[model samples]
Target: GLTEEQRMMIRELMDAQMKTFDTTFSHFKNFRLPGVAKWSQVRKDLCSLKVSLQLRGEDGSVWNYKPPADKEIFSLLPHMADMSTYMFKGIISFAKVISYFRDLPIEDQISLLKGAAFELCQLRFNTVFNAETGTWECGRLSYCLEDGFQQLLLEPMLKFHYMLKKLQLHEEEYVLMQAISLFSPDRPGVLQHRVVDQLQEQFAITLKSYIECNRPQPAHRFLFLKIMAMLTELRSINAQHTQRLLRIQDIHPFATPLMQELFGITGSL
Candidate 1:
């Protein structure tokens, strides 16, 4: 049950979102990563993190703070806040869809919602709490916060609800097709501008190839495909945002080493 304060908080958040930056900068502060190594190393990483968090494009040059273009600083808050709203709305829409379809035999609608909520919690922690730095660094990885909300939280929640409806209507084909529709071949739609038709064709081909290779029992394949689709979309959205955010801030001194470490984990692919 929603508390009056909780409901009021939502309204407040919504109203704040209508302002310049709203809570993005403040909300992101909750995710600020702490520094554990020497202050020198920590400072370096902080700079890099701020740059990377802004999702700026890379020019293979050092990042230093240039005064934001009059437009850049002013517009950044609303743009980010709008993205935040997209994510929140997506989550709400998904939950509503599921509630409307609750009468169907959908194999644990509440469980799916619970799982999505859990994953969202994980995503938030993962983005904010960097073990290596031992700090709250959400701002550094903030680019992906909205992505997680939209992909992991919003899409999956909505998708589960959508699946429920399909089950009720016996529209498994539509469900499967829609499930596949979530992934992007070129990139997430929110990161760039392109027609939905072109996006569908590009995304479909990649998904078709992936499905052909996975070759498993139908039930297992469906579950695996669903998980992979969400993860892939999440990563893509995060990666693009990371690139863009970095452009607006100065690169931290430790950025090179930290990225080098990440590359080792992610591999050179």
Candidate 2:
């Protein structure tokens, strides 16, 4: 079921490759392998580093998400757009945590970031999603998805958020998934697709291995695939979000300069 390109990369003995499906299995006992994770406290630091925002209130506490008045729905764009700038900054810090991103060509980094940023934003926020309440818990200020987002695209994003919450991924898993998304090979302007793909592959392998080794539930066996499915769903939601984001200026002109430059959204619309 694997491509020749994929098979060639993991070119192990035929029988071994068939049974395990990928060379990642060969690293089963060797968590210390070059790209594989040690799953130790040090590795957990990566999770913390990636999630902590570079831009924060002086006290570094959670900023309450104050939405518009009930009748001021038209102004919601400014609030969301403003919050997103900080989220984007945190995403950038997450990117900076990875040595791979630093070594990438500047243009490649910018390109990889642009198309991938919004998706990462969703994933990052997914951590704060409170499924029971159907609100994103950002510090003390929790708000419903419908508060800022239009109903047209809310269902898909909400569905994806629910799936992510159902998985209940560990912190390390969450950050690893973000890394996988960040180094996506197919992002429009990435110059070093080959290396970026490999970088992403390494994190995926590490995550898969982590799940297989630690989680004992039968359901956990397929957790990796479920996570992959969620990422796919996230991509679809991100496409719709981009379209909606472009129209915000026409309706509200609410986004900051960073938002415009990051997405290259131009014109009055």
Candidate 3:
């Protein structure tokens, strides 16, 4: 059984991580599509070449921005690049919350991180997913990609988000899910599998206790199973996204080493 103090510790860890995520991704969240800018420097920038923005309003109205002269408007690769940056930075930021992870041997740490990074990023990204509208919200803006990438990358994500929303998981439940993702015990090459499994079990115990204390409904018996199932689906989504990254890399070979490593596309031909 988990103690009150232990439960509170887990909550604090999650809160700290959530704060870090919000701060780190605020750059993208608050990014405004510039109307008019200089062309010379912008044209030479490869990073700016991949994304175009659209502003979605409340009543199903969307306002598309005109592409800058120097920037090519085609694929959602820039959005993926930006997402990869967020995912990498998020892993670095959330690493502090998982004390057990740091205790692992360096090789074990690398192994676990490579396996779990994408799933963890997807879990974090779900916080912003709007299930009802099938849109992403960042601060005051609600938007979707102007290209077909949404079908390829975001549609599966929306299904997961919809399931989570349907479950009406509270903040504490969300925290436990993220903790489970971070301390995944089944990653290949993990040297301390027993320790990781113990940590995951602790989170499961805490989450079960939490649901009992809060909901106490017989229907909630399957909640854990549902959440775990969502995790499984999330992994599938991550694999699909990884394939997309590889395909995009074929066209634009600008993914940084960190991005490649985090997405498990390192050295991919």
Candidate 4:
């Protein structure tokens, strides 16, 4: 058994790692462009940072366990792989969109365009998660996070842009422009599936109208509200499905043993 201090240290280190990961993901969200000069460099830095941490943990500084650490590691490998795949997909999509944005004339960089793109990305997150049930419902928080991201970042920026466009503010538009430049994605699929097709057709037609309207204020506001509603619907579906899946897990004999040992979880579904 581990001592209390050792356990505490492990917890602290785990928290630090999680914090760093959140910061790294925030960077991923902010840096969406591929040709941005610093893009490759920042990616390299993130890769190197992760490797260094992995090395430290493996160099016997963290724990002195018996052999087959790799097997123990393998047990959690699927989760890590899934997370990595998601990150990779997000990065690729973000980079592609940024490239398209770069080709647009400077005069056409409107708040509606930025807001639409951001909301679309939010929709992507809501729909992409494979959570069939419970705590695993990845899409459950999409709208909440989307709204938070917009309220904190997109809304203020748009208000500032409006001021700039109307000559109420004399500050350089480049500041807002650079900020907008950070908003890009690679997957046309995400835009197509999440916003244009699914949300617009199956859920709300307002999104399609607003996006097609080129950022008119009324249209943009409507899109925002529609996206919020879609997020709520996605969350509801996730909750219902997750509960059903868990009920199955509880009764399934094959999953019971590993589920209990590995996840400390038991379910009938």
Candidate 5:
């Protein structure tokens, strides 16, 4: 499942975001926030940020997005597709905000991003995952495990969520995990291997350092060990996502264009 042509638009968007000036930590405007309310400056350029979602306070606290008992599950798919485009934008912000990605060769960056994009998406979404109920209380919408996703994909994701929740990931842990996965030296098509390896090593150490200094429920090595293992776990999840998408396309179609491009799915399939 792969293609070309329209792929250039993603590259252009990445270029425009990278070369331009935010001058500040503009990438911090993330998911769960109220739609760029923190943007103090007007801009002709599109600016967004990393690893984040939205929800409300109807249960008076966090029940706004959960599906109503009377409402059917099919209604959520449109919003799910729509939010993914925003997630894709966040992925772009993720790469630009960090200096290490800027140092990687552009080809390597694309390769790493392409390979890790779906996994990063899962990691970001998992931050908001409701492990007990096996649901995702994402921005403005909620998803239950039984809500008609491809069972093959959803089953593993839900299981992975449980595995991840045990760590009680801090935001620093989440973002840096995304960062390391993005700078992967072995992602297919990467040309400059050693430099990517160096950068990834540093971020890996960064995660371990955060574990030792800030958290202690488990030993630091235990925490570090789980995060790296979960990253490896995510690789198969990413592959299944692509495979499931192709299977779905055999019957229906995937609406999110960026997802197709990010996953390297075939054109218009």
Candidate 6:
């Protein structure tokens, strides 16, 4: 049982952290890619081998040229870049509240981040997942890749999204879920595993108490277990997406630096 002061502090921290996440989500939600329709046309042209006749020089002289084979996929880059930025910024914002994360040994930090970043990103992305329609939306665009790409790229994600939606978590539960994923003690090579485990336990206790206070139904007794199950499924989806992204990088070597960072493709953290 936490002291009254400790409980108050936890509530304040949760509220402040939730506000940060909400601001980040709103910013990304409104982000737009200029000329998305034009870009989509370009992608279609490239996909169909409809070559542009020529490119204009600086002086407007026509020069014979062909776009690279990979140009067809470039249309997806803007959204991917924005999504990567949002994930990176969102994780940084959450880290601000978990002061001990920064206090860890540098190696431990990198290892833990590598193991956990995608799961954290998945948790954040759940805000935009529409389980009812089975779609992910950002700004004015539906997040589906062209040319049968979503079947490969997004199917795993949709499975987890559906599972999470069934839990029907409130905002507070979402915040706690994110925190639980972020403080993973079992991440390989964590220097202070016991300490990380203790922090996660504290968060769990806090969330359980919050749920009990707000939802005093006997049926709600298993809510925490259901949340845990949802998270477990989410991590499985994360692993699948990680492999899928790796395959994407293999085909299109143009993944943004931040995207590589999030997926742990870059050797350096």
Model 4 off-target regions past 4 Å?
A: 1-214, 217-221, 253-269
Candidate 2 — which pairs collide?
none
List candidate 6 stretches off by more than 4 Å: 1-9, 22-74, 135-154, 218-221, 266-269
**Superposed model 2: Cα runs more than 4 Å off:** 1-72, 145-154, 266-269
- The 0-to-1 C-alpha lDDT of every candidate, in the order given, reads 0.34, 0.62, 0.65, 0.30, 0.61, 0.63
lDDT string, candidate 2, 1-269, tens digits: 43454333233222221332221212222111111122232222111101111112447665333333321444344445666776776667666645668899999999989988898788777877777756665643445543223353246766677778888888667766777788889987778988998888876876677687679897777899888888877877677667665654544466688888787867553
Quote each prediction's TM-score. 0.21, 0.69, 0.73, 0.22, 0.65, 0.69
Residues 1-269 of candidate 4: C-alpha lDDT, one tens digit per residue: 43464344334433432332232233322211111143323222211101100111224453211212111222322333334344434433443344334444443323224323333333333223222211112321111111122354333323222222333211112112222223322222133222223312322232233244445555245443443444444334434433443443333222323223323353444
Candidate 6, residues 1-269: lDDT per residue as tens digits? 55684476467557656656653244555433423254444433222212222223346565442334455455544555666767776676676556556677777666777777677777766777766554555433344322333454345555566667676777778877877787788876788898888877877888877777778777677898888877787777666556655655565554566666656675543
Model 3 CA lDDT for position 68: 42
Candidate 1 least-lDDT 10 residues: 43-52
Q: Give RMSD (Å) of candidate 2 vs. truth.
A: 15.3
**Residue 160's lDDT in candidate 1:** 37
User: What is the TM-score (0 to 1) of candidate 3?
Assistant: 0.73
| Candidate 5 or 2, higher lDDT | 2
**Candidate 1: tens digits of C-alpha lDDT, residues 29-89:** 2222222134333232221222223322235443223222212222233333343343433
Model 2 alpha-carbon miss at residue 100, Å: 0.8
lDDT of 3 by residue, 1-269 (tens): 55886677576767667666773244555332443533343333333223245565558787765444432432334555665675677676676556666677777778778777778776666777666555666543444433343454435665576667778777778777777777887876788889889888888778777776777788787787788888888878766666655554565564767887765664844
Candidate 1 versus the native: TM-score? 0.21
